[PDB]
Design a protein around this nucleic acid. Structure first.
Ligand SMILES: Cc1ncnc2c1c(I)cn2[C@@H]1O[C@H](COP(=O)(O)OP(=O)(O)OP(=O)(O)O)[C@@H](O)[C@@H]1F
Length: 1726
RNA sequence: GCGCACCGGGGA
RNA sequence: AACUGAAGAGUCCA
RNA sequence: GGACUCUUC
């Protein structure tokens, strides 16, 4: 309060323009100490400074002395004047924020001027009214951040002290326009000696003012020394000429010292393959191939799923006895033997329960009732009878005869004999296998079909719900050997008429032991598996064969591979079946590196360490088998005898390497992945030297000295002039090369076209709150005693690790491990001391006892484990919605949350703001072949780093060469790569190792401190560079948190190693780091270091550095040796397109070219950029962002996009799954995959849906598509094209009617007979009437009966839980997202929706669960199984079912059932009506060709297939600029048609236009129709299709499949809308031509301009708000009078649009009308 | 026969 | 009681 | 405008 008022008195005094007019108000604002008087003076001063630039904007002279109208006339009270000649310009200004109130004030001003217009214009001088109403207190007389600081204080005065008014509330409307970095002045600057030290480091020995001559003389003396010491052997070469003969020999011998055999032929290789593993033994072996039992079983599963849980031992056994009774009854009557496996039978919950023990258990149970008091034969029946009544109570249904429950004497003499089911937990030789292994051929699809059935049973094993497993199998040490299953779980599958059973014991998603079991032979095989990894092979037996056949067609023409095609096909199929049977991550990586191998092979130079990068650590036998198969395949295709068709073989092998995508992304183990990610984070820092363990918010002195020391060490890299020479592998940037890079940026040598940067504080993007909101994660700090917690507790962590070790001992070590030995005694002693829960070793155990006793005094496991954590997690939206509940502004921008919020920092240092330092946290990413460490900062960190990124993206977009935030630049890069490979020019396909882990914010700080952006004005330049220096130093001192699991695992490992409980004494660096700290007594919680920018955190910042540094490197090389380079970078990726002279030099003197490549390597490394070993130089192929470009062909990644669609996509309802697969397949077709393979993938998805027991309606997938259904259509077109094949006769009549209709609506003729007649009501009568009124034969009565079953008709499907128009809502949300209350409503809705969606079971297993439950909502508040609906349809008479070949179900429902009391007639929807609606909406979107006649192709040209005839194609379209209907059109139409609802819902949220339509909008026909329909009928939205259009991205399609596709064919206003308003407005009220008046008109662009070309093109666009003058346009403002531009009573210029028949309707529809008409006509002549 | 950071998972 | 920062595209929803 | 899914870095 009292301090804030003094602060703003100082701020206004210090910062304010020296204008005398404002001075009088400034001297009065500094003295009114009364808070009300201070507030009034402040508002007055803001109003004066707003009205003083508007007068300087519109040219009017300011009435400083409030000269009344009489005063100026002699020489009510205006705010301006320009009276000259007969032209008087009266200006008045105001500031209102409410768009409703704005109108009131504007009307008042109009009245105040119009009450004297007549009197003034009566005698001599004519009046020209002018208004400059503003919507906020912007006031650029004050500097930008002050307008926010002053506004906040001014508002707070009345909000806190003036409690005695809510009218001028623009004091809440935020008045800023910039990024928000400048708001750091609102905080106190406490930057002490440390900041000065860091900056002095950044500015020491670095001479950034070199001229181009000094730079070019210093850069050609690095080259002489480098070249001489490279020829002399003192510098290690890093690039090797490609041999193609010594490079294959290197892949063959890659694993020679791991024991792999020298070589093998196919016969031994196939023999090994068909026997390697239990699955692979089983896939190629020789398998050599109603009932009351199911009625009880299928009925008792429901009974326990609808009754009490925790079914006791007694209750489950009754179900076993009942199933046995049913089985005996079926045996006696029917004479059948199914449902058994030897002497075990399938009981209720998959349970493979055994007869002998089920009989034996019943012997004891009945014997109990002998002493418990009719007889045994009657007592057991009464047990079942009591259960039977209770089971039936929960309301049979399915048939279930009760007569099979008479007595139990049958059990007493029931004997079933057979084999026993077993699981072998230990490895068994391939001699116990009972089938002739290796018989099934590979040339067919028998093996891919057995994997499909077996994989499906591995996925189904995750659905079993865990229940009590009485009757254990084995005891002691036999439990992990051959186990005789007395009670397990089983899943039955059926292979070629043989009933196999997958037998397991553990229920869940974890890795288990499975055993395949047969009724004739007992166990078949056993294995260990993680079921979640086995989904892609399900129902894909035909996709995975067409994939291999497609790849083989590529190489079928190589005449010198003509005798080797059979082996190549065999080997490819072997590779595919191996990676599908054994989904290993170490095989994923091995298949992935093959793309780098082949990329090197086709290229010219490669890194010397390439083959150390390709090598992968293999473990199992199948991984070495996979390497053997890959070696054989490559050795076949890449022979030196084969020379022709190299492009096809590169394509082939690259797709073989992309087969790695058939293995799931998910982590095989989480803890290992997390430990490895942390090792990746920590190892580079330990190797550098800087790991500051456990930093604090108030950084100590030792930490600061360490950071300064290592910052100094970062910059001291040496190169090629030191005796040791350049030292790669060392992080750092030189000083010579830093002061050359900045010396030539500050010189206009890098970016020349001579350049003109512009200040990136002004041009930086402004980020709202919702830009940073999502459902992703964010760290939440934990506070105790009011201070953030940053340290794990050693006592609590030690106790927790001891408890975990005790648990693991109890499960595993207690029952094994030679219980009289050392380790048993040690871990027993360590386990007794844990209470509550259900040598140096002596000293350490003493300490451990003390610590655990201390903790158990303090507390017993859940609380401890939650008290060790130091962080929590939320979503971005939860944190933001909590944050916006603290701010006090209207607009929700980031600057309002960091600096002007309630919990915002107050002072700041160079280490961090008042509210702690920036803090991240670590997690891991699940990706294909590799570990990514992920940094999740808390909310404040995310906001501040977002400000940094906005700044550096603003810089990067001003310089040409970065493809990170520039799609035009990326397309130019693609075109340049294509042209380069076309001419056979060299092209270096670069890649950078350790982008994140090596570049640091200190490097960016040094570079920023030495760069000069605006060399015209230096003060603002240095000030902005200062703001960014501060923000980048906050990232120098960030604290990265060590995950909880990592420290917990490390402490368990520590305790084990301390007690001696470990085999070896090998320790990686990370374990040393953790153990050194655990010994002294401190837990490493957070880590600070000089390195590690963060993976993708400073992404735009590092992209900017990459851009400028690469530009310097290419410039240096061009200066050194001729030529040139064209580099496109994308922040860790680069493509360098060499010149033609460099390409020639490669052939002239290849030693010189290798010297130039080595010099490029050296210069890059001296600037902290380590080129990856996966970097090639070549003339054959290019590479940028996984997009390969060979010369005379296209490279489709067929296997990546086939494999994308086959995975367990996390989808929740059966229509979402179909839409997802449609999208993936659209992507595939766009990227080279043929279409006949896409149809197979769609059939695979439909089969997955059918397995789930879902009715397959015509609206799921179209599995008969062409090329044209993807290139030219969208999803709605594919739905049309499926319905047009189900009922092709009627759709012809519907399309004839639609062609006749759509043509009339667009013209605008038949609107009422469509709108409010026959798009509402009974659908069939509507369709008939529409056909009648257009003179088209109506659909026959039979055609109107076709229907489709809509199971979500009444309400969407109720999915199991694991745990106002739409047009107005659309525009409302779009306009309201930028307001605090609007953002809060959106955020709250998203939070609740996400909390609901997270509890829904997702995936194939969840889909089957959902569709097996009561998922169909009945008409009036009830739930029914899908089977209930299908049964009621089956009973009802007349409803037929029809199906096409694929399985698409369309019904036939007579048109009298809805009347005739049919409860299942409300689920059906007529199919022609839906066809009409789909066809109409997609004709609005795609075009009018959709309504033409489908004509099949009659090619008959007898051409060759040519499988690699790929052809780029573009979706042909007709409307590009004609139908660019935007949001403004819909807003204007909505206001015109529905005013009250518009002003109730859309007016408050509307700005940047402020309702300045002036009633000259075009009044679009066919848009008002759509708007009127969407307000009324909310079933179909036509307006969302008008604003939608098919993109013009290219599709790479086979040129043969393009010929077989069907053929169908039927058939600037943005600028002119601006010109339209000016020409018609001028007549009613002549207006002044200024920047604010012209831009005020709603229609306005954001030398064909003609009359206003000069001002709009540059003057308006640049930002100078000046009046348009006669000096331009070929100091007196030009008043726009009726029909021409006027200067002094004469039309010095004239403007006129092309008036039309409809344009004149607006002008004559405006309510002096004749006078306006008369003057209009005279102008039209000239 | 899984995981394969020595450490976990593999019958309530 | 675990999985980020961006880029492109598509689908759905109100 | 929000959500979701694929590919990329
Ligand atoms: C911020 C972020 N969040 C999640 N994912 C990210 C990133 C970033 I920046 C890159 N990626 C992805 O990581 C894969 C390549 O990883 P990459 O092949 O480079 O492994 P690597 O160990 O660094 O190999 P080199 O150092 O020898 O180049 C690839 O999907 C993509 F690049």
């Amino acid at each position: 309060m009292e301090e804030d008022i003094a602060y703003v008195k100082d701020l206004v005094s210090k910062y304010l323009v020296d204008n005398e007019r404002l001075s009088r108000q400034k001297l009065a604002f500094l003295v009114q100490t009364e808070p009300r008087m201070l507030l009034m003076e402040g508002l007055k001063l803001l109003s004066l400074c707003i009205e003083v630039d508007s007068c300087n904007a519109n040219g009017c002279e300011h009435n400083s002395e409030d000269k009344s109208v009489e005063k100026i006339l002699h020489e009510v009270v205006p705010d301006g004047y320009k009276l000259t000649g007969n032209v008087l310009i009266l200006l008045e200004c105001f500031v209102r924020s409410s768009p409703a109130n704005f109108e009131q004030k504007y009307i008042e001003d109009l009245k105040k001027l119009e009450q004297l217009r007549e009197d003034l214009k009566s005698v001599d001088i004519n009046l020209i009214p002018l208004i400059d109403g503003r919507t906020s207190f912007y006031n650029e007389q004050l500097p930008d951040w002050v307008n926010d600081k002053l506004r906040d204080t001014l508002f707070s005065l009345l909000r806190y002290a003036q409690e005695s008014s809510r009218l001028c509330e623009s004091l809440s409307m935020t008045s800023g326009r910039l990024s928000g970095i400048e708001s750091l002045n609102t905080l106190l600057d406490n930057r002490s000696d440390h900041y000065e030290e860091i900056i002095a480091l950044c500015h020491q020995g670095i001479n950034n003012k070199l001229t181009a001559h000094e730079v070019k003389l210093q850069i050609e003396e690095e080259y002489q020394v480098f070249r001489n010491r490279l020829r002399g052997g003192e510098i290690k070469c890093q690039f090797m000429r490609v041999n193609k003969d010594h490079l294959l020999s290197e892949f063959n011998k890659l694993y020679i010292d791991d024991g792999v055999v020298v070589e093998e032929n196919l016969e031994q290789l196939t023999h090994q393959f068909k026997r390697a593993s239990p699955i692979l033994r089983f896939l190629y072996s020789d398998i050599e191939g109603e009932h009351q039992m199911q009625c009880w079983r299928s009925f008792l599963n429901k009974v326990k799923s609808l009754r009490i849980l925790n079914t006791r031992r007694k209750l489950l056994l009754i179900f076993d006895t009942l199933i046995l009774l049913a089985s005996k009854y079926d045996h006696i009557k029917q004479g059948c033997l199914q449902g058994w496996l030897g002497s075990c039978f399938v009981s209720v919950n998959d349970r493979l329960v055994s007869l002998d023990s089920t009989k034996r258990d019943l012997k004891k149970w009945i014997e109990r009732r002998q002493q418990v008091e009719l007889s045994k034969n009657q007592i057991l029946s009464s047990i079942i009878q009591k259960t039977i009544k209770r089971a039936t109570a929960a309301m049979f249904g399915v048939d279930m005869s009760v007569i099979g429950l008479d007595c139990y004497d049958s059990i007493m003499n029931f004997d079933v004999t057979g084999v026993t089911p077993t699981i072998s937990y230990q490895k068994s030789q391939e001699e116990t296998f009972p089938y002739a292994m290796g018989v099934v051929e590979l040339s067919e699809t028998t093996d891919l079909g057995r994997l499909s059935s077996l994989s499906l049973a591995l996925i189904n094993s995750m659905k079993t719900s865990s229940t009590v497993k009485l009757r254990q199998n084995e005891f002691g040490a036999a439990r992990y050997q051959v186990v005789r299953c007395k009670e397990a779980y089983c899943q039955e599958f059926l292979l070629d008429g043989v009933k196999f059973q997958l037998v397991y014991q553990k229920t869940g998603e974890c890795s288990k032991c499975y055993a395949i079991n047969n009724d004739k032979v007992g166990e078949v095989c056993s294995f260990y598996a993680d079921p979640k990894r086995y989904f892609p092979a399900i129902f894909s037996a035909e996709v995975l064969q067409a994939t291999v056949d497609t790849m083989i067609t590529w190489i079928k023409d190589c005449n010198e591979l003509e005798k080797e095609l059979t082996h190549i096909k065999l080997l490819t199929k072997m590779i595919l079946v191996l990676i599908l049977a054994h989904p290993s991550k170490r095989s994923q990586k091995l298949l992935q590196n093959l793309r780098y191998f082949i990329m090197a092979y086709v290229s010219d130079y490669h890194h010397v360490d390439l083959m150390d990068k390709i090598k992968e650590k293999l473990i199992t036998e199948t991984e070495f088998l996979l390497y053997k198969l890959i070696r054989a395949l490559i050795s076949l295709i890449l022979c030196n005898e084969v020379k022709s068709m190299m492009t096809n073989r590169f394509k082939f092998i690259l797709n073989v390497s992309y087969m790695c995508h058939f293995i799931t992304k998910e982590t095989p183990d989480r803890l290992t992945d997390q430990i490895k990610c942390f090792e990746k984070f920590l190892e580079p820092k330990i190797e550098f030297g800087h790991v500051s363990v456990n930093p604090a918010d108030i950084a100590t002195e030792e930490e600061l000295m360490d950071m300064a020391y290592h910052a100094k060490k970062f910059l001291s890299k040496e190169g090629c002039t030191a005796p040791r020479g350049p030292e790669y592998k060392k992080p750092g940037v030189s000083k010579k090369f830093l002061s050359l890079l900045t010396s030539s940026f500050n010189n206009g040598s890098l970016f020349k076209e001579k350049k003109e940067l512009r200040d990136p504080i002004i041009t930086s993007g402004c980020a709202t709150a919702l830009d940073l909101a999502s459902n992703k994660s964010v760290v939440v700090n934990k506070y105790t005693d009011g201070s953030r917690v940053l340290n794990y507790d050693f006592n609590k962590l030690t106790a927790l690790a001891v408890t975990q070790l005790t648990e693991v001992f109890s499960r595993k070590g207690k029952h094994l491990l030679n219980r009289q030995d050392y380790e048993y005694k040690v871990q027993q002693a360590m386990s007794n001391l844990v209470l509550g829960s259900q040598g140096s070793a002596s000293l350490y155990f003493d300490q451990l006892r003390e610590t655990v006793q201390k903790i158990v005094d303090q507390y017993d496991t859940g609380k401890l484990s939650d008290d060790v954590r130091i962080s929590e997690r939320e979503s971005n939206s939860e944190a933001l919605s909590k944050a916006l509940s603290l701010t006090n502004c209207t607009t929700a921008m980031l600057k309002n949350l960091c600096f002007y919020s309630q919990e915002s920092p107050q002072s700041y240092n160079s280490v961090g703001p008042d509210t702690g330092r920036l803090k991240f946290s670590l997690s891991y990413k699940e990706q294909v072949g590799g570990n990514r460490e992920l940094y999740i900062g808390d909310l404040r960190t995310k906001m501040f780093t977002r400000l940094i990124e906005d700044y550096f993206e603003a810089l990067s977009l001003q310089l040409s060469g970065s493809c990170l935030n520039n799609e035009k630049e990326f397309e130019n890069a693609i075109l340049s790569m294509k042209l380069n490979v076309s001419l056979a020019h060299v092209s270096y396909s670069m890649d950078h190792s350790k982008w994140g882990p090596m570049m640091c914010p200190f490097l960016f700080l040094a570079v920023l401190q030495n760069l000069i952006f605006l060399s015209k004005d230096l003060q603002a330049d240095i000030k902005g560079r200062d703001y960014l220096s501060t923000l980048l130093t906050w990232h120098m001192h960030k604290m990265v948190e060590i995950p909880f699991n990592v420290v917990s695992a490390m402490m368990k490992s520590f305790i084990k190693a301390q007690l001696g409980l470990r085999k070896s004494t090998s320790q990686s660096i990370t374990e040393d780091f953790f153990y050194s700290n655990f010994q002294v007594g401190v837990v490493p919680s957070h880590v600070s270091s000089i390195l590690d920018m963060g993976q993708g955190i400073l992404h735009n910042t590092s992209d900017f550095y990459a851009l400028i540094s690469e530009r310097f490197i290419n410039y240096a090389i061009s200066s050194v040796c001729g030529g040139s380079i064209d580099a496109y970078t994308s922040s860790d990726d680069q493509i360098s397109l060499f010149n033609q002279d460099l390409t020639d030099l490669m052939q002239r003197d290849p030693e010189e070219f290798k010297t130039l490549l080595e010099f490029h390597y050296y210069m890059s490394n001296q600037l902290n950029k380590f080129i990856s070993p996966k970097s090639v130089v070549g003339r054959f192929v290019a590479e940028f962002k996984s997009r390969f470009y060979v010369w005379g062909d296209e490279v489709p990644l067929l296997t990546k996009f086939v494999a994308a669609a086959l995975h367990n996509i996390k989808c929740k309802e059966p229509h979402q799954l179909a839409e997802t697969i449609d999208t993936i397949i659209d992507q595939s077709v766009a990227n080279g995959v043929p279409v006949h393979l896409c149809n197979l993938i769609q059939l695979r998805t439909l089969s997955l849906l059918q397995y789930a027991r879902y009715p397959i309606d015509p609206f799921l997938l179209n599995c008969e598509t062409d090329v044209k259904d993807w290139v030219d259509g969208n999803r709605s077109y594919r739905i049309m094209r499926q319905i047009e094949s189900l009922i092709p006769e009627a759709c012809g009549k519907i399309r004839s009617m639609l062609r006749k209709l759509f043509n009339k609506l667009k013209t605008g003729q038949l609107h009422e007979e469509f709108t409010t007649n026959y798009l509402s009501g009974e659908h069939v009568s509507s369709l008939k009437n529409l056909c009648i009124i257009l003179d088209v034969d109506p659909p026959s009565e039979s055609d109107l009966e076709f229907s489709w079953l809509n199971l979500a008709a009444y309400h969407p499907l109720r999915m199991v839980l694991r745990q106002i128009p739409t047009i107005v809502k659309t525009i409302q949300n779009k306009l309201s997202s930028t307001f605090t209350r609007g953002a809060q409503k959106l955020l709250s809705e998203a939070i609740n929706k996400s909390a609901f969606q997270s509890s829904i079971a997702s995936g194939f297993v969840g889909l089957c669960r959902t569709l097996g439950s009561k998922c169909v909502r009945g008409p009036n508040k009830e739930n029914l199984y899908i089977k209930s609906i299908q049964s009621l349809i089956s009973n009802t008479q007349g409803i037929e079912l029809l199906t096409n070949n694929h399985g698409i179900q369309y019904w036939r429902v007579p048109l009298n059932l809805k009347e005739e009391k049919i409860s299942v007639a409300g689920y059906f929807r007529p199919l022609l009506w839906d066809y009409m609606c789909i066809s109409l909406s997609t004709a609005i979107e795609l075009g009018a060709w959709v309504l033409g006649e489908p004509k099949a192709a009659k090619p008959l040209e007898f051409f060759k297939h040519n499988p690699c005839d790929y052809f780029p194609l573009k979706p042909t379209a007709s409307k590009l600029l004609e139908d660019r209907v935007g949001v403004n059109h819909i807003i204007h139409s909505l206001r015109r048609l529905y005013p009250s609802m518009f002003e109730k819902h859309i007016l408050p949220f509307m700005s940047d236009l402020a309702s300045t339509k002036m009633k000259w909008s075009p009044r679009i026909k066919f848009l008002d129709l759509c708007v009127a329909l969407d307000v009324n009928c909310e079933a179909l939205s036509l307006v969302s299709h008008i604003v939608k259009w098919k993109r013009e991205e290219h599709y790479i399609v086979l040129s043969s499949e393009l010929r077989l596709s069907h053929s169908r064919s039927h058939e600037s206003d943005a600028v002119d809308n601006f010109m339209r308003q000016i020409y018609f407005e001028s007549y009613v009220r002549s207006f002044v031509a200024t920047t604010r008046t012209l831009g005020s008109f709603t229609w306005f662009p954001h030398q064909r301009l003609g009359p206003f070309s000069s001002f709009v093109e540059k003057v308006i666009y640049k930002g100078i708000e000046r009046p348009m003058f006669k000096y331009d346009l070929m100091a007196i403002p030009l008043v726009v009078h009726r029909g021409g531009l006027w200067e002094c009573n004469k039309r010095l210029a004239s403007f006129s649009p092309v008036l039309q028949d409809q344009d004149l309707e607006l002008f004559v529809r405006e309510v002096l009308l004749i006078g306006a008409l008369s003057a209009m006509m005279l102008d039209r002549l000239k």
